[PDB]
Every structure is written in C-alpha cells, then in structure tokens.
C-alpha cells in the first residue's frame, strides 16, 4: 500500500518470501483469536467478583441499604482533603426527604464525553428513573449485553431495556488480515412500550400542503427525533453508511460496558474527564 | 477544587446524600482492587500464549534471514491483502528474481520506519544501523513484573553488541496515594542497555558549541559533546525518582513506555503489514 513502490521493485524471489510471511501472519492472527476468546472468558469469570460491589452500589443508590461507618470515612473527593474537605461536607444540611442518590445514572452518563452527545434534553427526565445499568457477557451467543433498569415511570412500561451485541471473535474469512479484535456482527435493541404522546423517539412536524383536499392547510407528520432511546432501535446489518452507524452504536456500548459501569461514581463525581 | 467537573453539584449535595457518595467511593476502590487482579490474569494469559506465537515468529525470522525457502502453499498466498487478479499477476512479473537478494532486506527497518510513532524516533543517521536489525523480539515476566523487548543485530561496524535489550518494570497494583486513578498496568521503570560503540560512530552523542554557564569561560562558546537525536536513545531511557525534574521525566517516561507498547503490542505481531505498508499506526484495521 504505502510502500507499494518498494514492493513493486522487489525481485520475485523476495516477493515470494513476503507471501510466505502473509501466510504466517494468518496463523499468528488465528492464535490472537484464541487469546481474545480467553480474555472474554476472563471478563465472564470476573463478573461474579464484581457483582458484590455493584449490587452493594445499587442498594446505596436506591436508599435500600445505609452506608457503614467505614464508608463514611472515605473521602468524597480523592483530590485535596484535610480541613479544606470538612467545609465541603458542611456546605448543605441533611434532607431526610432526599432518599437514595437522585439522578445518579443520568449524571454518570451525561458526564461521559461520548454518551453526553446522545442524551438530549427531552431524554433527561426519563433517565432520572434509571435505577441501575448492568452488563454481562456470553459465549454460546458470543457477545455481551447491557441492561438498563427503569423504575415505574409515566414514559413507558418497560422495567428493563436490553441492548445485546453479537460479537465475532474469529477473523473474517474475506478480510483475514484485517483482524484487530472482536468485531460486531449484529446489534439487537429492544421494543419500548411507550405511553401515549410521550414517545421521544418520534417527532411531529408541520407542513403546508400545496395540493389536494388539504391544500392551504398544515398536516402534522410524525418523524424521527434525536434521542438516547434510539440506542434500543439500532441500525440493521443483514445506504452502506450504516457500517458507520453500527460502529457508532457499538462504540457507545463499549463506553457503557468498559468504562462507566466499573467507574460509575467517578463519572458521577466528575473525577474522569 | 476543580479537579471535579461536577464539583458544583457535589458541594450542594445534602450531607445524607454525600455520605452515600462516600460509600460509593469505598466500593469504587474494591472494584478497582478486583480490576487489578484482572489485569494480572490477562498478563498471565499473555505469557501463556508467547509459546504459541513463538513458532510463527521463529518461522518468520528464518524466512527474513533467508534460512528457509517458501513452500508452495505460501507462494500462492497473496502478497497484498487488497485488490488482486490480473492486476496481481503483473506485480509478480514487475521484477525478476535476483539470487543475491537473500532473505528480506531491510525488513525491521522498514517495519519500524512505517509506524507513525516510531518513524519520529528514527533519524536518518540511524537508518544504516537498522539494516543490521535481524529480529525484534518481546516477552513478558512475572518476577520483575513487566515485559522486555530485545533487538537482535548482526555483526556490524557501529557497535559490538549482538542484542540490545529494553526492559520495562510494570506496576499492577493501585497507587496507595491515588487508587481511583488506576486504569491498568502502569510503567514504574524502563531500563535500557549499554551499547559498546565503536570509534567515531556513536550516533547518540553530538559535538556542539554551547554557551558556558559557569567558570572562566562563562558566557562563551565551548565545544561540548552532548546528546543527539537518535532512535538509540531508546536504550538510555529517563530515570524515575532515584516541573522540570518531576513533570518532565514522568511525561517522558510514559512516552518511552508508549513506544515500547507500540513495538510489543502492535508492530511485532504485525511486522509484515508495516513492511508492506498496509498498516501505519496503532489504529489497526
């Protein structure tokens, strides 16, 4: 490609040596596929190890379990602390009506550079009903899953919105050297049973009709709006722009699974930027 | 204290909620401590696979040296994983075989020169040395936790060393006075190697006139011998702690590591693709 001029002038006996290295490069890649699969099993094996601290965190956010004294001693901001810290705790008094941690997952998702662009303002009060975000991996349907848990809400009846990605760990047969890790095959969202007139994924538009029975009058059409909850209506795999869009969907699921869920409080508090 | 981009929300938080956030920081450390064990087991996994790669890398070293002849299956494998047909066959006939061209000349020089990050480290006076580069190899270790890169040189007029080794010491446990910044294995120390240079051919040094700061010739131009820009400063990395002595080295030390990572994690597994030029960065595809 970018050294094509050198490759062209290579004598044929040397070219054949380069062909031999490409054949070897396929074998090295096949092993790298076995590696990533064993890394995948490792992510799964550790899910049980994380579960305790993630379950404990869900109880704190819902107000279902009260913090222990040892937890009170942990500094709220690992930054500068001493008496400079003590006046921070004294900045606002306790409110027994303030139960749990309000707007927790909204704040963590809004604080991530990539995700914040997906959250529009008409999405904001919906994500306030977000109790927990969950992820889990799988081998037989190879890939992982993200579960969004919503409390009872006036926007829709669903209590969990699931986003599942089907991942391929083997090199593509008609692009074997292109392999750099697990690639997406398919993304499957979820169907949202919205309540009336509150579907944010949809949008009403007015246009003057020029001809017909409604000439000189406005019809109200319904079209797509920008919303985070389009995340659960992903592009299909099967304008060839989709291959950009599917990756854009995937790059968001990666951010949610790999970074925010293990570091939720640090995005809430803003110690990562 | 605007290390926190949500500081305004955190301050006005009522205290009973603040206490809930403190509890989440306690949990975040436990998650990180578990994440520390994960990266350790990925490290153990990387070591376990070294034996599996070695054969294919050993086969590749033999091909580059001209020690082994390609097989029929390999002759049929396309040289360029791009467009090929009759567009391909005319490439093979573009130049005739030369039996004096043994092995693959300038392989590792071309592979490293083709990488975005490394090409900036290779200056022109480094080029004829890297033609003596026979093989680049890397391997990880537990006891001094980290990994190592060894550069294999044939006999050469530039120095006597036959292998130059670059060793990185990695930390897999969270910082005791920064546990929440943990995001993976971090570099503790990078250790280069002493190069037995020949006479008048040491590229790492450079004779320059420089204004003297103290002494009898203060304010005057002496001929000092000082460091030159060369890839081979890679083997004299900055030291750790044993705005100019802290935040300089600590930035340079990571920059050294980020080069060893590219060499270990990206170039060595994909050497031929950098040679052929189908990759030029850690943005693989």
Automatic annotation (TrEMBL), chain A:
Tagged with keyword Iron-sulfur: no
Positions with a binding annotation for Zn(2+): 40, 43
Pfam families (UniProt xref): NAP
Keywords: Cytoplasm, Metal-binding, Nucleus, Zinc
InterPro entries tied to this protein: NAP-like_sf, NAP_family
One GO biological process term: nucleosome assembly
Cellular localisation: Cytoplasm; Nucleus
Any GO CC annotation of this UniProt entry: nucleus
Keyword Oxidoreductase (UniProt): no
Chain ranges passing through the membrane: none
An example molecular function term from Gene Ontology annotations: chromatin binding
Chief location category: cytoplasm
PANTHER family per the UniProt record, alphabetical: TESTIS-SPECIFIC Y-ENCODED PROTEIN (PTHR11875)
Family: Belongs to the nucleosome assembly protein (NAP) family.
Name of the protein in its database record: Nucleosome assembly protein 1-like 1
């Amino acid at each position: 490609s970018t050294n094509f001029d050198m490759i062209q002038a290579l004598p044929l006996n040397v070219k054949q040596r380069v062909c031999a290295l490409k054949n070897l490069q396929m074998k090295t890649i096949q092993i790298e596929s076995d590696f990533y699969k064993r890394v995948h099993e490792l992510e799964i094996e550790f899910e049980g190890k994380f579960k305790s601290t993630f379950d404990q965190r869900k109880a704190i956010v819902a107000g279902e379990v009260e913090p222990t004294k040892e937890q009170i001693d942990t500094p709220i901001l690992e930054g500068l602390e001493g008496d400079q810290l003590a006046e921070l705790y004294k900045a606002a008094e306790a409110d027994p009506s303030a139960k749990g941690i309000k707007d927790f997952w909204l704040t963590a998702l809004r604080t991530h550079d990539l995700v914040a662009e997906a959250i529009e303002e008409h999405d904001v009060p919906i994500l306030s009903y977000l109790t927990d975000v969950t992820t889990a991996a799988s081998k037989d349907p190879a890939g992982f899953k993200i579960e969004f848990h919503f409390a009872t809400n006036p926007y829709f009846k669903n209590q969990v919105l699931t986003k599942t990605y089907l991942l391929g760990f083997d090199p593509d047969a008609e692009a074997p050297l292109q392999f750099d890790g697990p690639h997406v095959i398919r993304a499957v969202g979820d169907t949202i049973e919205w309540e009336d007139g509150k579907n944010v994924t949809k949008k009403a538009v007015k246009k003057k009709q020029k001809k017909g029975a409604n000439a000189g009058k406005f019809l109200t059409k319904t079209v797509k709006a920008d919303s985070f909850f389009n995340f659960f209506e992903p592009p299909k795999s099967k304008d060839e722009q989709a291959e950009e869009f599917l990756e854009l969907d995937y790059e968001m699921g990666q951010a949610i699974r790999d970074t925010i869920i293990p570091r939720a409080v640090l995005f809430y508090t803003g110690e990562l930027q």
